[PDB]
Amino acid sequence: MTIDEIIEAIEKLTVSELAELVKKLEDKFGVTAAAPVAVAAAPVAGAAAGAAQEEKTEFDVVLKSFGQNKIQVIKVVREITGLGLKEAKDLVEKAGSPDAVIKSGVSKEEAEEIKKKLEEAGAEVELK
Amino acid sequence: MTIDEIIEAIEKLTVSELAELVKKLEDKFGVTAAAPVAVAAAPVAGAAAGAAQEEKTEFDVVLKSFGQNKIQVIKVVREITGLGLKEAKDLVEKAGSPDAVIKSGVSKEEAEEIKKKLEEAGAEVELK
Amino acid sequence: MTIDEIIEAIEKLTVSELAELVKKLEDKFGVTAAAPVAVA
Amino acid sequence: MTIDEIIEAIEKLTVSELAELVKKLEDKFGVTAAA
């Protein structure tokens, strides 16, 4: 293909497809030789990830309030993300804010499986 | 968080979260400084990509047959993918093959929508 | 798979063209060498 | 968000440790660099 067509094609890639393309490159060419495309494609993948949320190909789980039970809301979050007290806590303390996203790029199933659980620890959980 | 804590945390992110994280790192710290995390995260997201697929979250469109008009199917494939003419032909002539995947990492209705378009060109296609 | 067609098209590019690929991709997503503002 | 939370963590790992995190990640999924 032409440079332009490789770009158009790349720009039509799914975030997952992009990820796998770059992974395959690092496998094929080595991380050094493939890094150029890795860094150049990332913004393209991120853009797309952001488009998916923007549409409904994927959803996020936003904390709207930790409420009376904050120590547990946190305990849960860490079980879900792998974060740490400070981190998980800094995040949880953002409840009610847009930043308060505890997960994203997920299907609308897990959206509930995680949301519910977050409510199971007494927490306000809105999906988007 | 400890390095392992972070690696754990990273291996729990979705393909999109990894996408958006690397992108954010590039915009904030430049590609130079961001490149290490970019090429280290790629395989993580590639794994996520696979996981997604293998779990019917995110689906693909496989060409079982290019039908009665291979040319019409190549035209559509090229429309869907932005792929050049020879690469489109190459990919279409793999119809029947497991890796004759026209697209992946896509939603269900989107996988259907694509499937339908290929079918309208006379191709046999399966979703997974 | 499609990505393979692209990976095969990238593999065939000369190094300068790959540099053109990267340039076009980077110019488009406003990527920069170096943190735009001080992360001091 | 969680990724921000993860970026803030990576952002304070000293040049080593990050080099560490990198190699660990690369080893887990097929350390290339050269391939």
UniProtKB/Swiss-Prot annotation, chains A, B:
InterPro entries: Ribosomal_bL12, Ribosomal_bL12_C, Ribosomal_bL12_C/ClpS-like, Ribosomal_bL12_oligo, Ribosomal_bL12_oligo_N_sf
GO cellular component term, pick one: cytosolic large ribosomal subunit
Keywords from the UniProt entry: Ribonucleoprotein, Ribosomal protein
Gene3D superfamilies: 3.30.1390.10, Single helix bin (1.20.5.710)
Pfam families: Ribosomal_L12, Ribosomal_L12_N
GO molecular function: mRNA binding; structural constituent of ribosome
Entry's Gene Ontology BP terms: translation
Quaternary structure, from the entry: Homodimer. Part of the 50S ribosomal subunit; present in 6 copies per ribosome. Forms part of the ribosomal stalk which helps the ribosome interact with GTP-bound translation factors. Forms a heptameric L10(L12)2(L12)2(L12)2 complex, where L10 forms an elongated spine to which 3 L12 dimers bind in a sequential fashion.
Family to which the UniProt record says this protein belongs: Belongs to the bacterial ribosomal protein bL12 family.
Cited function: Forms part of the ribosomal stalk which helps the ribosome interact with GTP-bound translation factors. Is thus essential for accurate translation.
Protein name: Large ribosomal subunit protein bL12
Gene name per UniProt: rplL
Swiss-Prot record, chain D:
TM region(s), chain numbering: none
Top-level taxon in the UniProt lineage: Bacteria
Subunit structure comment from the entry: Homodimer. Part of the 50S ribosomal subunit; present in 6 copies per ribosome. Forms part of the ribosomal stalk which helps the ribosome interact with GTP-bound translation factors. Forms a heptameric L10(L12)2(L12)2(L12)2 complex, where L10 forms an elongated spine to which 3 L12 dimers bind in a sequential fashion.
Function, as annotated: Forms part of the ribosomal stalk which helps the ribosome interact with GTP-bound translation factors. Is thus essential for accurate translation.
Sequence similarity: Belongs to the bacterial ribosomal protein bL12 family.
Protein name stated in the entry: Large ribosomal subunit protein bL12
Coverage span on the entire protein: 1 to 35 of 128
